[PDB]
Amino acid sequence: YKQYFDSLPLKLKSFFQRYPPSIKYSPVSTSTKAINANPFLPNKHPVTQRFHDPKYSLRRMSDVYKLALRYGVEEFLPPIENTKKLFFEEKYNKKTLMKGVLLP
Amino acid sequence: VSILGQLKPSDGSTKSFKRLGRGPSSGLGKTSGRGQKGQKARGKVKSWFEGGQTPIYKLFPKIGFTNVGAKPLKELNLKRIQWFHDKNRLHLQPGEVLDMNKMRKLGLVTGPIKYGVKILASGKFHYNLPIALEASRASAKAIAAIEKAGGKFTARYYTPLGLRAHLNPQWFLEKRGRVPLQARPTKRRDIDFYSKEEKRGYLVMEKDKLLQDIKEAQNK
Amino acid sequence: LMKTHKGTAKRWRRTGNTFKRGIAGRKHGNIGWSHRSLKALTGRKIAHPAYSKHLKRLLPYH
Amino acid sequence: LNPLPNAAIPPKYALVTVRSFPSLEPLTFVPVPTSTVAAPLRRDILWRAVVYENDNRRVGASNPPGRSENGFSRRKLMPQKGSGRARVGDANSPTRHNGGRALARTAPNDYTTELPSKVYSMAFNNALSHQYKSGKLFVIGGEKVDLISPTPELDLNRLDLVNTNTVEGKEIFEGEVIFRKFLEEFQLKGKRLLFITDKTREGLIKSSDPYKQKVDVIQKELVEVNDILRAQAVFIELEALEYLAMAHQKEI
Amino acid sequence: APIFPKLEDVKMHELIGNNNFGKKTYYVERSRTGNLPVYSAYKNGGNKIITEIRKIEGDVIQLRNDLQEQLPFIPKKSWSVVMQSKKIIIKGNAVEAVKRVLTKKF
Amino acid sequence: TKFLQSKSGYLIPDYELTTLSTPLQFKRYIKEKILPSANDPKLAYKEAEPNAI
RNA sequence: AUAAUAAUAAUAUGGUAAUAGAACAUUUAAUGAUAAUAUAUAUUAGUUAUUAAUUAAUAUAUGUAUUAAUUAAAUAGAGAA
RNA sequence: AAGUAAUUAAUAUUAGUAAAACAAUAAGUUAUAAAUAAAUAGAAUAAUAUAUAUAUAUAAAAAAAUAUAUAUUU
RNA sequence: AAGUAACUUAAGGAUAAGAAAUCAACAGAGAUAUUAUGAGUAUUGGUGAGAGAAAAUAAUAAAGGUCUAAUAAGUAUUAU
Ligand SMILES: [Mg+2]
Ligand SMILES: [Mg+2]
Ligand SMILES: [Mg+2]
Ligand SMILES: [Mg+2]
Ligand SMILES: [Mg+2]
Ligand SMILES: [Mg+2]
Ligand SMILES: [Mg+2]
Ligand SMILES: [Mg+2]
Ligand SMILES: [Mg+2]
Ligand SMILES: [Mg+2]
Ligand SMILES: [Mg+2]
Ligand SMILES: [Mg+2]
Ligand SMILES: [Mg+2]
Ligand SMILES: [Mg+2]
Ligand SMILES: [Mg+2]
Ligand SMILES: [Mg+2]
């Protein structure tokens, strides 16, 4: 099991190291000071009241998610609900067709 | 002795290059083929410089436009398929359709299939194959010939990425552990084409979800 | 490397082993002339063999 | 009635004797296909291969200074008129004795030509076939294949000398001596030799080094058409020969 | 599958210098895809058509003679056999006829 | 063929071995090629001058 | 049904600009016997329908042709600036 | 002491392979279908053009142009 | 012609660039640099002279991601 984990791609492994799955990170935006602050969401800083940009910028987050999908390790990553990105089959199914497609 | 000191080119391969400015009896003597004394003698005028008259790239009006939205399909005639079958190169298991990927594999179509394949009817008389075909589209006559043979055509939509995936699914698996999903037709023209029963478009023939959704939207 | 003469490309299009072009003299001053006579100038025209070589040199990738 | 009376099926396998190295002793025959070892000797193809290879080999270091490259000033030496002498510009002109060269090359000159891969393969086969015909293609092996006659006690099936690196008594060593003895036996002292190995035979090349000017030890991958043809007698490993055949076979 | 077969399976007639293939006999090998090597060629700027026949093993002269016998309708003059590469050129587009003649044996 | 080579002292080439189908043929070949050269060393084939008379 | 050489009959063979075909000298690279009775260069006189090479004599060098030949190439040929 | 080199395009001759070629990692270029400004069009319904394909035109033909078809695809 | 020659200034062993307010197109990719194809294609021009991408696929390449910022205002945007 440990060997299989080690065999995972580098970026994914790094992510797991620095945001581990024992902590249930929040689905919604949170305080930046919070422990359960989602790195994919923009969390608000409590003093200044300014939204900090996500700790994992959107491309990196997407890459991480794709890696998780590849190796079946999605649920151990923190939730990507309130980040607007969907991926692959879920994206395909859930999306509404454009107004131009349905109503030319 | 080694052959290495007795090798010649094949007769008719090589030539002596015309060597100028190297004596009178050579032929290409002092003037070196230039003629005598003009601009072309010692300098450079352009080959297509017409003298000052309005040139043949100016007299005439500029015509047409380049349709950048165009995506030219590679044409495959029924005749070629028939020939392949006769030669026993058309390897198909029963039930397996002769798709664009399959055609490429076989060597029916060859070179890069960028946008798709159209099936044309240049040997529709001697076509007698009951196998099922699937391409970007087919000629009406070709379709009729296929039907007569006891075959079954389906015009299938493929975006360039989707087409590529279809042709070489293993590459995508190797790279990413997952072949990409086949796109819906976003364009209006594309939707219209595959919604035609006369074209044997996949949206009507398979009774697709997109078409139904469009109909529902129209109703509402 | 060599490149296409863009004006020539705009004027001339390929037709097998020749080039086709539009006719000159049908952009203004058409009124007064016979319409039947003018219909000669409406279509396209194949390149004359005199300037075929020139056209080839202008359009190396055609 | 009979359409093509003289039609027939050609022969497809030539026997090459598999030998033990130090002393070229027949161990077995091995039927290599006719296309590799007994093609009709087409000179034109061979020529094409050789010239192409030679062109590839070129260093192309010719670098004479043109009138720009040459290092004089740009100043006009004598005024256009009123000098009583011929018209001159700068001192770099090809016309003058210290000036730069006209139409000067500039290194590194690229002399690389191309060849179709199939043509090259055909040439490679052809050279090998020619060598076989001559009686200058010594296939050494017996490790993989099933033998008829057993290998000798002091020979070995691969193309190498034993205990070459060992040198305890005197400065002279044994592998060199063995090589010299071999040369003496087969009457090829001054002749060009070409040892086509499969893997790096370090001891063999050490043994050769005395006769480096005539003996060329090459790998299976880096062997050339030129190398094969120049050779007065090639000494190829069976495995290496197999590999070459596989490489330059016409695909089906 | 194996490039060099074993010594047992190879017959004597399969070897070189057996069955007399050189003397007045020939073979015409098919292409990779499995077709007869007979081709139209449009030389001198599409002006000179000629039919080329490739991949001939053995005696080309004999083969040419046999083809002439088969096709008397083509003249005797128009059969140029180039000896360096061993291929036999015919003047017209006489490809299909040649193929028909060859098919039965090759 | 190996035996013949060993007794002879000379090497019969691989192509030749492939070609010749009988002992008689081998003998004839030997008589043709090696024998005269063995008899007279000036008559022997030289490599650098292959077209010698 | 070809190639080389030689016969016979016929026709053709002045040439600037130009086009086409075929050779030679020189230098380098690949292959490469041989040897002071030899090789190279020069001079003189012979020879071969001869920008070339060869024979002999004479001279000077060298223990010796990147030699003959086939290929690959060129800073490849000078009474004209 | 003077027609040279590089990157390209078009012809020709030969050689390799050939309905494919080059390349083999895929990708690409050329060929395999002719057109048309362009479009969702594209080559015998029962044979040589008197048939068919495309562009103009049209209900569909005819008409101009080019192309495609008479054991084996070029 | 050319942001070339030149002059001027400033740095380092290299500099520059670099982990998307990027591309793409309803499928997707995943920093930058250099090269090959894409392609002399799209694009543009007193529509003359001429100029001319990108996506995508390959190589070369290194572990290539990673916080150092309390997440940014006379800024984005607009007019000129
Ligand atoms: Mg002249
Ligand atoms: Mg004048
Ligand atoms: Mg003059
Ligand atoms: Mg002039
Ligand atoms: Mg009139
Ligand atoms: Mg060359
Ligand atoms: Mg004359
Ligand atoms: Mg000179
Ligand atoms: Mg002089
Ligand atoms: Mg003179
Ligand atoms: Mg209309
Ligand atoms: Mg500018
Ligand atoms: Mg830096
Ligand atoms: Mg920010
Ligand atoms: Mg911000
Ligand atoms: Mg502004």
Q: What does this entry list as its resolution, in Å? A: 3.2
The whole-angstrom separation of Cα D132 and Cα D240 is 15
- The Cα D22–Cα D41 span in angstroms is 31
Among D187, D176, D219, D183, CA closest to D201: D219
Residue E83 CA to residue D41 CA, distance in Å, equals: 12
Residue E7 at interface with chain F, using a CB cutoff of 8 Å = no
Cα separation, A45 vs A54, whole angstroms: 12
> Are E12 and F21 an interchain contact pair (Cβ–Cβ within 8 Å)?
yes
Question: What gap in Å lies between CA D138 and CA D234, rounded to an integer?
Answer: 6
Residues 87-116 of D with CB under 7 A from strand G: 94-95, 101, 105
- Residue B78 in tokens: 């029924």
Which two three-digit tokens encode residue B106?
Answer: 């076989």
**Closest chain B residue to the Cα of E82, Cα to Cα:** B11
Angle at D3 between CA D1 and CA D6, to 5 degrees: 120
Tell me the two tokens of residue D53: 């290879």
Neighbouring-strand partners of residue D139 = D18, D236
Which tokens is B129 given? 């194959």
D55: nearest Cα among D119, D126, D110, D122:
D110
Of all nucleotides in the shown strands, which has a C1' nearest the CA of D103? H4
Question: Which pairing describes strands D233-237 and D137-140: parallel, antiparallel, or unpaired?
Answer: parallel
| Residues within 5 A (CB) of ion ligand 4 | B 35, 38
Q: At D130, which helix (H) or strand (E)? A: helix D117-134
Asked if D204 contacts D160 with a C-beta cutoff of 8 angstroms, the reply is yes
Q: Please, what sign has the CA dihedral across residues A42, A45, A48, A54?
A: negative
Q: What is the CA radius of gyration of chain F?
A: 12
DSSP A83: S
Find the largest Cα–Cα distance for chain D: 98
Phi and psi for B100 in degrees, rounded to 5?
-65, -40
Quick one: DSSP state of residue E24?
A: S
CB contact under 8 A, A89 and B218: no
Let me know the angle formed at the C-alpha of F26 by F20 and F31, rounded to the nearest 5 degrees.
135
Cβ D208 vs Cβ D195: under 8 Å: yes
List strand H contacts in D 74-103 (CB < 7 A).
Answer: 94-95, 101-103
Buried b (16+ CB within 10 A) or exposed e, D101-120: eeebeeeeeeeeeebeeeeb
List the structure tokens of B212.
């139904």
Q: Residue D149: which residues within 8 A CB-CB, separation 6 or more?
A: D25, D26, D27, D28, F2
Spatial distance from the CA of A73 to the C1' of I35 (Å): 38
Any residues with CB less than 8 A from the CB of F45 and at least 6 apart, and which?
Answer: F37, F52
- How many whole angstroms separate alpha carbon D125 and alpha carbon E21? 21
CA proximity to B82, closest of B137, B139, B146 = B146
CB atoms under 10 Å from CB of B185, counted, come to 22
Where are the alpha helices (H) located in chain F, listed in sequence order?
2-8, 14-19, 23-39
E51/E41 Cα distance (integer angstroms): 6
On chain D, the residues whose CB falls within 8 A of the CB of E102 are 4
Distances (CA, A) of B44 to B162, C53, C60: 52, 18, 20
Cβ atoms E11, E72 nearer than 8 A: no
| Contacts of A61-70 spanning 24+ positions with Cβ under 8 A | A61/A85, A62/A87, A63/A11, A64/A11, A64/A12, A64/A15, A66/B176, A67/A8, A67/A9, A67/A11, A67/A12, A68/A12, A69/B178, A70/A9, A70/B176, A70/B177, A70/B178
- Residues of C engaging B, defined by a Cβ cutoff of 8 Å: 5, 7-8, 10-13, 21-24, 27, 44, 51, 54-55, 57-58
- Are the Cβ atoms of E33 and B87 closer than 8 angstroms? yes
Neighbouring residues of B21: CB distance < 8 A, sequence distance ≥ 6: B28, B29, B30, B32
Q: Measure the CA angle with vertex A61, ends A58 and A64; round to 5°.
A: 155
CA B30, distance to chain mean position in Å, is: 51
What is the DSSP-derived secondary structure letter of residue A31?
B
Distances C34 to B21, B77, B98, C40, D225 between C-alpha atoms, Å: 60, 47, 58, 11, 76
Rounded to 5 degrees, what are φ and ψ at B215? -60, -45
> Which residues contact residue A65 at a Cβ distance below 8 angstroms, ignoring those fewer than 6 apart?
A74, A77, A80, A85, A87
Q: At what angle do helices D117-134 and D43-57 cross, to 10 degrees?
A: 110
Q: What is the dihedral of CA B50, B54, B58, B59, to 10 degrees?
A: -120
CA distance to D49, D121, E9, per residue, from E21 (Å): 29, 25, 21
**B213 in contact with chain A, both atoms CB, cutoff 8 A:** yes
CA angle at B191 for the pair B186 and B194, rounded to the nearest 5°: 135
Count of residues making up chain A = 104
E chain contacts of residue F25, beta-carbon cutoff 8 Å: none
Beta bridge partners of D13: D33, E15
| Run of H or E including D229 | helix D225-230
Q: Which of the 14-43 residues on chain B come under 7 Å of nucleic strand G at their beta carbon?
A: 14-19, 22-23, 26-36
Distance, in Å, from the CA atom of E56 to the CA atom of D221, rounded to the nearest integer, reads 31
Q: Which residues contact B11 (CB under 8 A, 6 or more apart)?
A: E84
| C11 to D80, D192, F11: CA distances (angstroms) | 49, 66, 77
Residue B41 CA neighbour count, 13 Å, CB half:
7
Amino acid at B103: M
d(CA B156, CA B99): 10
d(CA D115, CA D168) in angstroms, rounded, equals 51
Query: Coil, strand, or helix at residue E52?
Result: strand
Where does residue E44 fall: left (phi above 0), alpha (psi -120 to 50 degrees), or beta otherwise? left
Q: Which residues pair with E82 in a beta bridge?
A: E87
Question: Residues near B189 by Cβ (< 8 Å), separated by ≥ 6?
Answer: none
The nucleotide closest to C59 (CA, C1' atoms): H9
Return the structure tokens found at B42: 């010692």
Neighbours of D143 (CB within 10 A): 13
Instruction: State the Cα angle at A47 between A41 and A52, rounded to 5°.
Output: 25
Q: HSE (CB half, 13 Å, CA atoms) of F38?
A: 9
Q: Residue A97: list chain B partners with CB under 8 A.
A: 184, 210, 213-214
Rg (CA), chain D: 28
- Give the DSSP letter of residue D210: G
Distance CA F4, CA F27 (A): 10
The token duo for B19 is: 């060597």
Residues of D in contact with E85 (CB under 8 A): 42, 44
What is the bridge-based pairing of β-strands E87-90 and E79-82? antiparallel
- Measured distance CA(F26)–CA(D211) in Å, rounded: 36
- The tokens for A79 are 């939730």
SS (H, E, C) chain B: CCHHHCCCCCCCCCCCCCCCCCCCCCCCCCCCCCCCCCCCCCCCCCCCCCECECCCCCCCCCCCCCCCCCCCCEEEEHHHHHHHHHHCCCCCCCCCCECHHHHHHHCCCCCCCCCCEEEECCCCCCCCCCCEECECEECHHHHHHHHHHCCECCECCCCHHHHHHHHCHHHHHHHHCCCCCCCCCCCHHHHHHHCCCCCCEHHHHCCCHHHHHHHHHHHC
Residues β-bridged to residue B118 = B75, B137
Given a contact cutoff of 8 angstroms between Cβ atoms, the answer to whether D223 and D217 are in contact is: no
d(CA B75, CA B83): 16
Instruction: Give the 3-state secondary structure of residue A5.
Output: helix
Which amino acid is it at E51?
T
Distinct helix (H) and strand (E) counts, chain C: 3, 3
3-state secondary structure of E40: strand
How far is it, in rounded angstroms, from Cα B179 to Cα B47? 53
Report the residue count for chain B: 220
Tokens 């079958």 appear where?
Answer: B85
| DSSP type of residue D233 | E
Q: Which long-range contacts (CB under 8 A, 24 or more apart) does A97-103 make?
A: A97/B184, A97/B210, A97/B213, A97/B214, A98/B186, A100/B186, A100/B188, A101/B184, A101/B186, A101/B191, A101/B210, A101/B214, A102/B213, A102/B214, A102/B217, A102/B218, A103/B217, A103/B218
Tell me how far apart the alpha carbons of residues B152 and B150 are, in angstroms, rounded to a whole number.
7
Question: Please, are residues B133 and B98 in contact by the beta-carbon 8 Å criterion?
Answer: yes
* 3-class secondary structure, D223: coil
For residue A40, how far is its CA from the centre of ligand 15 (angstroms)?
14
Interface of D to B at Cβ within 8 Å reads 43-44, 46-48, 50, 127, 130, 192, 226, 229-232
| Structure tokens that stand for B167 in this block | 């042709």
DSSP state letters, D53-88: HHHHH---------TTTS------SS-SSSSSS---
Do the two chains E and B touch, given a threshold of 8 Å on CB pairs and at least 3 pairs? yes
Strand D25-33 versus strand E38-42 pairing type:
unpaired
Contact B64, C13 (CB under 8 A): yes
Residue D29 phi, psi dihedral angles, 5° rounding? -95, 155
**Closest nucleotide to residue A59 (Cα to C1')?**
I30
Q: Looking at chain F, how many residues does it have? A: 53
Looking across all nucleic acid strands, the nucleotide with the smallest C1' to CA distance from residue E87 is H15
> Can you say whether the dihedral through the CA atoms of B153, B154, B158, B164 is positive or negative?
negative
Q: D55: buried, middle or exposed (CB in 10 Å: 19+, 13-18, 0-12)? A: middle
Regarding beta strands E26-28 and E56-58, do their DSSP bridges make them parallel or antiparallel, or are they unpaired? antiparallel
C57 touches strand I (CB under 7 A): no
Distance CA A99, CA B195 (A): 18
* Chain F residue with minimum CA distance to D26: F2
DSSP state of D222: T
Which among E27, E86, E104 has CB closest to D8?
E27
Reading across the β-sheet that carries B137-138, which strands appear in turn?
B74-77, B117-120, B137-138
Could you tell me which residues are beta bridge partners of residue D118?
none
In terms of DSSP bridges, do strands B117-120 and B74-77 run parallel, antiparallel, or are they unpaired?
parallel
**Cα angle B134, B140, B144; round to 5:** 80
